[model samples]
Target: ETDICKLPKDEGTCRDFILKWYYDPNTKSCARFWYGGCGGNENKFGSQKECEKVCAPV
Candidate 1:
């Protein structure tokens, strides 16, 4: 099945800090990911702890 993080997040504004996160179906967890320093989606979390809190517990 398609994931949610695969969506794009372009607000028509410039972003400096690049953040990314991926939701793993098997583990049912959110992990750190790499960004191209440009556009992305809301899947990006501020930290791993927050990512886990947001995407963990499958």
Candidate 2:
């Protein structure tokens, strides 16, 4: 786990839905998650591959 590093730390703005990726240390993999333009952490990415690129599991 990167401890929420290398991901978007905006907590984003929500009025519309958006796709975001995050590294699940439990699974040690990048997973698809939705950003509702509201509160979030640094564990957000724009794409699966993008997330994996930095947080890919060994």
Candidate 3:
């Protein structure tokens, strides 16, 4: 849901050092961030396009 976009950036708990993307409500855009290998929420996306598809303002 759109609420996912409002969620704050979460780095998760693991230490696998995987690159990921999230929606930044402040900038109204998708931004890159580091994600752990596990335990992250659905707010994390594998690509910028995927993040925007769900969070981008219509």
Candidate 4:
């Protein structure tokens, strides 16, 4: 279940220009990215805190 952190970042296919966050396993941190508004995977988060809370190493 913790594999969510290892999931790849998906910015989706749309073009809405929405801001989002995702966990970068390589950097071991949460990073900001642009979301397309639809079709993105669960790896996406609404905020840095949310992404870090779920993906950051304990």
Candidate 5:
């Protein structure tokens, strides 16, 4: 099994979960990961360096 999660969020289980991203007017592109939120979704970036230091590295 591929544990594809870059970070373990609160909703993330033993199964790896990628992140959810959206463009904010003040923050531009930002990310917050959820369980089962990425496969139905697309075009998510693994890296969010542009999003500033809000994301915690797991």
Candidate 6:
């Protein structure tokens, strides 16, 4: 649902994009959602709205 926002400004679905943060070694940009606030663990998502709502950024 949120993917709409991440898609495009006008093409977006008007919904907020569900984004986290990923480290692109090629681009050197944090663009994907890994886990654990960036370098901790995939079990603990620091920024990304993980599959676990209870553990997401509140």
What TM-score goes with each of the models?
A: 0.45, 0.60, 0.76, 0.74, 0.28, 0.24
- State which candidate, 3 or 6, has the greater lDDT: 3
- lDDT per residue as tens, model 2, 1-58: 5556544434355765577777777776777766666555577778878777877876
TM-score of 6: 0.24
What's the distance in Å from true for residue 42, model 2?
1.7
Best-performing candidate as measured by TM-score: 3
lDDT of 1 by residue, 1-58 (tens): 3555344432323456555565665666666655544454565666667767865655
Q: On residues 1-58, what C-alpha lDDT tens digit does candidate 6 reach at each position? A: 4322222112123344344553333433334432222223232223334323422222
lDDT of each: 0.56, 0.67, 0.77, 0.79, 0.41, 0.31
Candidate 4 lands at a TM-score of 0.74
By lDDT, the best candidate is 4
- Provide the clashing-pair count of each candidate structure: 1, 2, 0, 0, 0, 5
* Cα shift from native, residue 41, model 5 (Å): 2.2
| Model 3: how far residue 17 lies from native, Å | 2.7
lDDT of 3 by residue, 1-58 (tens): 5577768776878878677888888777777888776767767888888887888845
Off by over 4 Å in 4: none
Higher-TM-score candidate among 3 and 5?
3
Best-first order by TM-score: 3, 4, 2, 1, 5, 6
Candidate 6 lDDT (Cα, whole model)? Answer: 0.31
Q: Which stretches of candidate 3 lie over 4 Å from their true place?
A: none
RMSD after Cα superposition, model 2: 4.1
For residue 1, model 1's alpha carbon misses the true position, in angstroms, by 11
